[PDB]
Design a binder for this molecule. Structure first.
Ligand SMILES: [Br-]
Ligand SMILES: [Cl-]
Length: 127
């Protein structure tokens, strides 16, 4: 059927989308398994299901590589916000190793909530 084509998209937004679509095919993404803090079993299952959906979109629609080693990934998707992770967590230790790297190439850390909004804005029907 007819493909959606937003004739009202301005150049800012269409350029943002174009550059993201191109860049996403070049990177490695990690959907990190570690939770920042304790949560009840049923609440962890809800998060895991959301992480799996994001994984499928990144791998299959956005064409990113998916890794189990977050130290090789360009976008690191977390099961909470970075401030939720304790200093003892390697996610926080690595984040701290990168914080003062003035290196535009360094990894970015996104909660699953932040990631879901990004994917929605890229045109996918997600929660
Ligand atoms: Br802490
Ligand atoms: Cl944001």
């Amino acid at each position: 059927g007819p493909k959606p084509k937003n004739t009202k998209e301005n150049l800012s937004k269409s350029s943002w989308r174009q550059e993201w679509l191109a860049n996403l095919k070049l990177i490695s993404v990690s959907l990190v398994d570690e939770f920042p803090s304790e949560l009840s079993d049923s609440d962890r299952q809800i998060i895991n299901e959301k992480m799996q959906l994001l994984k499928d979109i990144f791998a299959n629609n956005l064409k990113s590589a998916i890794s189990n080693n977050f130290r090789e990934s360009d976008i690191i998707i977390l099961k909470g916000e970075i401030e939720d992770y304790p200093m003892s967590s390697e996610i926080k230790i690595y984040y701290n190793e990168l914080q003062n790297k003035p290196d535009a190439k360094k990894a970015r850390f996104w909660s699953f909530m932040k990631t879901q909004r990004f994917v929605s804005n890229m045109g996918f029907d997600i929660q």
